[PDB]
């Protein structure tokens, strides 16, 4: 085999690729890939070894050797001015119109997403980079079929780019015959095309990093960032990252993650769906760790509240932000439904603010004013809650973080999981990873917890609360039944115009396999061009 330090490209070099994959951009991307891919692959291999040790009966806990880091005083390098107030952030797709609408929402920050809310078609990743570049440059515009123009308002929200996670390939660009890391593709191009303009306007190249499992993974990101900074003669810490704590292994390494990424990190986030998905994957072989209906596994449950409290305390100890979770409701024409939704949003955001979270997430601009009002009210004149140390809290232990919550495993819950996951998958395979389903803007994590919970119940041969043993055969029976429900809900036209048979097949494949696959996006990505 050759010792090449060059990349190969599988798609035609058309007008879009000519904009984004310029000679200079490709040179830089090549350098990152050859310098950092081997270590990235070693990190993926380390994941396997760590998981095996957990499977083999040793539960995760804090790291003994790094005690001196945790029990020392130190803080992150710093937070730039435009990241000191992040009380509400909106998330969404890198599609052109959606970028404009999000930047125009009444929020502090827009996280443009190449990750869970994107089905990573080549055209969509390339268009996404085009869109974000136009957004940074302030020229982004869109005119719809009806002739209505969309443009940026004055003072749009601060832009942050969420990259694909460490496990994901970008199959259309290869090094030594293997797909390069999507993480490097997404990071390299957003940074390269935008760092100059961002810095010139008083902002900076900002990233969201998903699905981290270890401090060593944080260290690798720090090296990537430092490499990028050095290459363009930027001072250390110019690139700023916010890092989701949304895997079980990561909750035991928050302080080490902050330390490893100290030059660049500005905050951590709580999640729900990815976290409990990870809980099940991590504890997959443990008969005493079966979670009930994921619908009932709410953030106020003891293990999730402990997670929340530990994350806030840890972040504030180090001067980093501690971001709360997602309210993904989509307002409807039903004002009564809307009142109930807004009451729920108010209750949930108030819980987060009262706990000390510096900010929170929404998926739809229609929730901005409500979420903002909760945080405005509780913050008073403060920009954030960095001073809230939670020093009154008792220590938080591994036992507490690992304790499965009370609840029932219900047939209604199982059926709903099937309907939501199938409809999510149908859209994803059709190129849409940000999917309105039953009044919620769903991303891949929802499909993940849905399939993973069912897998868990099958694996450990658990009964539903009505006494029915959960089996592959029961699942398959229910799948067929729920497909008919979906058909009735959507109507014959939409159902026939869709990819529901292909979606049901992928669902069955990922749910009924003996081995619990890590991510549905891996087999799913095979279905994309
Ligand atoms: Ca081993
Ligand atoms: Ca997530």
Curated annotation (Swiss-Prot):
GO cellular component: cytoplasm
Pfam families: MS_C (PF20659), MS_N (PF20656), MS_TIM-barrel (PF01274)
Alphabetically ordered keywords of this record: Cytoplasm, Glyoxylate bypass, Transferase, Tricarboxylic acid cycle
Subcellular localization(s) per the UniProt record: Cytoplasm
Taxonomic superkingdom: Bacteria
Pathway in which this enzyme or protein is active: Carbohydrate metabolism; glyoxylate cycle; (S)-malate from isocitrate: step 2/2
Primary location group: cytoplasm
Cited SUPFAM superfamilies: Malate synthase G
The reaction(s) this protein catalyses: glyoxylate + acetyl-CoA + H2O = (S)-malate + CoA + H(+)
GO terms for MF: malate synthase activity
Catalytic site positions: 162, 443
EC number from the UniProt entry: 2.3.3.9
InterPro entries linked to this entry: Malate_synth_C_sf (IPR044856), Malate_synth_sf (IPR011076), Malate_synthA (IPR006252), Malate_synthase_CS (IPR019830), Malate_synthase_TIM (IPR001465), MS_C (IPR048355), MS_N (IPR048356), MS_N_TIM-barrel_dom (IPR046363)
A single GO BP: glyoxylate cycle
PROSITE patterns with a match to the protein in the record: MALATE_SYNTHASE
Family: Belongs to the malate synthase family.
Listed PANTHER family: MALATE SYNTHASE, MALATE SYNTHASE 1-RELATED
Database matches in NCBIfam families: malate_syn_A
Name of the protein in question: Malate synthase A
Organism: Escherichia coli (strain K12)
Gene: aceB
